[PDB]
């Protein structure tokens, strides 16, 4: 059920950036693998900023914040979803607390579900790790309102993840970059809502280097989605 797709062209997209990457695509429970390092799909990596999605779900579900709260630029949880915003989501993680965080991460079963003893950095340097296949499954469940959280909480977090609209397609997702571990890990995890309402989920995972532009992840994602006729 998890197979290499028609990967002739996309393999070369990653080769031209001289790095190792995988793109996982999930349609209705069919998963296909693309890129030039397909073994990455079942390899565990720190989630980095992609964990903000689950942090937000947990914080909103447990009424540790709400979508209108202004965190002292002064900004909301949703505004902070796009930005670096280490202070907002670190503050939210401290409000949740280590015990509730570990309980929720175990209930969701996210990755290896281990968060250690420091509630405000376990997603960046370990010990929490997750595979790209696990990330695409998680975000597919979010997109379909199938996670075990309030429907309204899931809708509110989805609304924070809109990256852009084009020609009737909506692209939702979340970037991550673990720059302080070696090798560095880059993420772009999300989904496409096609004009007729169909959902196609993706998880891009690649080795980063410090000279790369952050936009390299979106660049590779968009050219691959176009080649696959997903957009
Ligand atoms: C999450 O992955 C990042 C922080 C919150 O941990 C957040 C910030 C930027 S990375 C900043 C450094 N750039 C290169 N080393 C980011 C991202 O671009 O995905 N996410």
From Swiss-Prot:
Factors inducing expression: Expression may be regulated by promoter elements associated with upstream insertion elements, such as ISAba1 or ISAba10.
Enzyme class name: hydrolase
GO biological process: cell wall organization; response to antibiotic
Intrachain disulfide bonds: none
Modified residues (N6-carboxylysine): 52
Active site: residue positions: 49
InterPro entries, alphabetized: Bact_Transpept/Beta-Lactamase, Beta-lactam/transpept-like, PCN-bd_Tpept
GO terms for cellular component: periplasmic space; plasma membrane
Annotated binding of a beta-lactam, by residue: 49, 52, 84, 175, 177, 217
Presence of the UniProt keyword Acetylation in the record: no
Domain of life: Bacteria
A Pfam match: Transpeptidase
Stored Gene3D superfamilies: DD-peptidase/beta-lactamase superfamily
Subunit structure: Monomer.
The protein's name in its UniProt record: Beta-lactamase OXA-23
Species for this entry: Acinetobacter baumannii
Gene: OXA-23
């Amino acid at each position: 059920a998890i197979v290499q797709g028609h990967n002739q062209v996309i393999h070369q997209y990653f080769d031209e950036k001289n790095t190792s990457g995988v793109l996982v695509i999930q349609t209705d429970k069919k998963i296909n693998l693309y890129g030039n390092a397909l073994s990455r799909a079942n390899t565990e990596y720190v989630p980095a900023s992609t964990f903000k999605m689950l942090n937000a779900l947990i914080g909103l579900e447990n009424q540790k914040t709400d979508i209108n709260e202004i965190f002292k630029k002064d900004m909301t949880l949703g505004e902070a979803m796009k930005l670096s915003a280490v202070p907002v989501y670190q503050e939210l993680a401290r409000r949740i607390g280590l015990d509730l965080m570990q309980k929720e991460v175990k209930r969701i079963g996210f990755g290896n579900a281990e968060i250690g003893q420091q509630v405000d950095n376990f997603w960046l340097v370990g010990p929490l790790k997750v595979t790209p296949i696990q990330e695409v499954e998680f975000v597919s469940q979010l997109a379909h309102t199938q996670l075990p959280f309030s429907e309204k909480v899931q809708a509110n977090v989805k609304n924070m993840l809109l990256l852009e609209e084009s020609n009737g397609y909506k692209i939702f997702g979340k970037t991550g970059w673990a720059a302080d571990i070696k090798p560095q890990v880059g993420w772009l995890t999300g989904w496409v809502e096609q004009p007729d309402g169909k959902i196609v989920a993706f998880a891009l995972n690649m080795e980063m280097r410090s000279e790369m532009p952050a936009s390299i992840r979106n660049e590779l994602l968009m050219k691959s989605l176009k080649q696959l006729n997903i957009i």
